[PDB]
């Protein structure tokens, strides 16, 4: 057994102080953050209006990995940042097809937001509205049809889109589930 002071100062030197070490590590994560929405929410106190910013932000690699996140702070920058982290720990993967599109047609429901996605022919681009379109674009889906029915709220539509593309079943897996060869379901 080596002394307690040198080994605990080794776990103290290995976990670095937050006041002596500045932060930008994020581009080494291989991710890009896109700010969807910036709103000023308010808590009210006996003094007056206590102002905050809420940022809804999605992150993707444009390579088939995407996530949504929501954050709150006093400054635009900080909320952006929190949103970034909350998203990064919430992240999932969208099933893709050789042509960069969806396996099939799907609906989704989150709150009052309903979302309609359907696959497209290559060269149609991504046609959709703000939340759905940023989510899908950041996932890297190249050709997709989508329409949000029901409500318009950015956040809910994002989450609904995630619910959509999460339940998407790729053909290999339905072949495996049903217990039937691919070529038989192809027909």
């Amino acid at each position: 057994l080596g002394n307690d002071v040198y080994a605990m100062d080794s776990k103290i030197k290995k976990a670095t102080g937050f006041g002596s070490k500045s932060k930008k590590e994020k581009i080494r994560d291989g991710f890009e953050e896109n700010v969807v929405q910036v709103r000023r929410v308010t808590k009210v106190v006996k003094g007056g209006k206590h102002m905050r910013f809420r940022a809804i932000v999605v992150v993707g690699d444009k390579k088939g990995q995407v996530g949504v996140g929501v954050g709150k702070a006093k400054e635009v920058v900080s909320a952006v940042q929190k949103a970034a982290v909350d998203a990064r720990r919430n992240i999932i993967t969208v099933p893709m097809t050789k042509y960069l599109t969806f396996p099939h047609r799907n609906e989704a429901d989150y709150g009052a937001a309903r979302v309609m996605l359907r696959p497209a022919a290559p060269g149609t681009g991504v046609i959709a509205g703000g939340a759905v379109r940023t989510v899908l674009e950041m996932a890297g889906v190249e050709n997709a049809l989508g329409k949000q029915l029901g409500s318009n709220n950015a956040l809910n539509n994002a989450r609904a889109t995630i619910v959509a593309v999460q339940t998407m079943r790729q053909f290999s897996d339905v072949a495996r589930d049903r217990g039937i060869p691919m070529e038989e379901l192809w027909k």
């Binding site: 307690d4 002071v5 776990k11 103290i12 290995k14 976990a15």
Partner: protein
């Protein structure tokens, strides 16, 4: 690899019984077996398969070099856990469990920093140069920090295997490990839902004997796995 289990020893230590039929969760109805005098009786042929798979993954995870926690907060299970963890040379929680031990790491670890400074203080003998209020206060810090950080105070980094006693009372452990991507190997009585753990072993709650039986089996798996990770690295 094999482990030590038979119908006779599990019959001995009293694993097969659990809480009254007013108190049960029907979510467990698939693998329960009988009901006697309004006292439920849980299937042991499932119990052996789960305990086998549990000691197997415990052996593979010990052998690869992964780190272990064990948890129960009860009165008897605490006296059993300090010794289970000393016998397997692992990390433990017996006394009051703090919310955020796993999930919120950063603040837990700074709490460990200051507890380490306190451990150096107390052995240095520099608590004798202080006013009486200062020594009583530093002794509050010590009492608390020993209660909560007592068994984890070796561990640096995030624990990737957690073992638990009686998930009914242990809810936050289950939540935190569900959240962080950690496996739970847990004891189930007739009142608890088999959602909350990765490998959930049908077991007994009220009995110190069942706790000792299954925990000694598991700490023996961690011990032989400890021989295999003393060898492989």
């Amino acid at each position: 690899r094999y482990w030590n289990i038979n119908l006779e020893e599990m019959m001995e230590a009293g694993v097969h019984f659990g809480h009254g039929t007013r108190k049960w969760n029907p979510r467990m109805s698939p693998y329960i077996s009988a009901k006697c005098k309004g006292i439920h009786i849980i299937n042991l042929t499932r119990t052996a398969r789960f305990l086998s798979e549990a000691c197997d993954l415990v052996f593979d995870a010990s052998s690869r070099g992964k780190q272990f926690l064990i948890v129960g907060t009860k009165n008897k299970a605490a006296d059993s856990v300090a010794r289970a963890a000393i016998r397997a040379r692992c990390h433990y929680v017996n006394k009051k469990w703090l919310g955020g031990m796993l999930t919120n790491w950063s603040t837990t670890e700074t709490r460990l920093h200051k507890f380490r400074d306190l451990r150096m203080e107390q052995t240095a003998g520099r608590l004798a140069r202080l006013p009486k209020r200062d020594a009583a206060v530093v002794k509050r810090q010590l009492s608390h920090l020993q209660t909560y950080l007592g068994g984890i105070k070796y561990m640096t980094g995030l624990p990737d295997i957690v073992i638990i006693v009686d998930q009914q009372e242990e809810y936050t452990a289950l939540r935190e490990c569900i959240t962080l991507g950690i496996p739970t190997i847990c004891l189930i009585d007739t009142n608890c839902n088999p959602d909350l753990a990765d490998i959930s072993i049908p077991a007994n709650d009220d009995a110190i004997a069942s706790i000792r039986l299954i925990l000694t089996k598991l700490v023996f798996a961690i011990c032989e796995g400890r021989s295999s990770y003393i060898r492989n690295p």
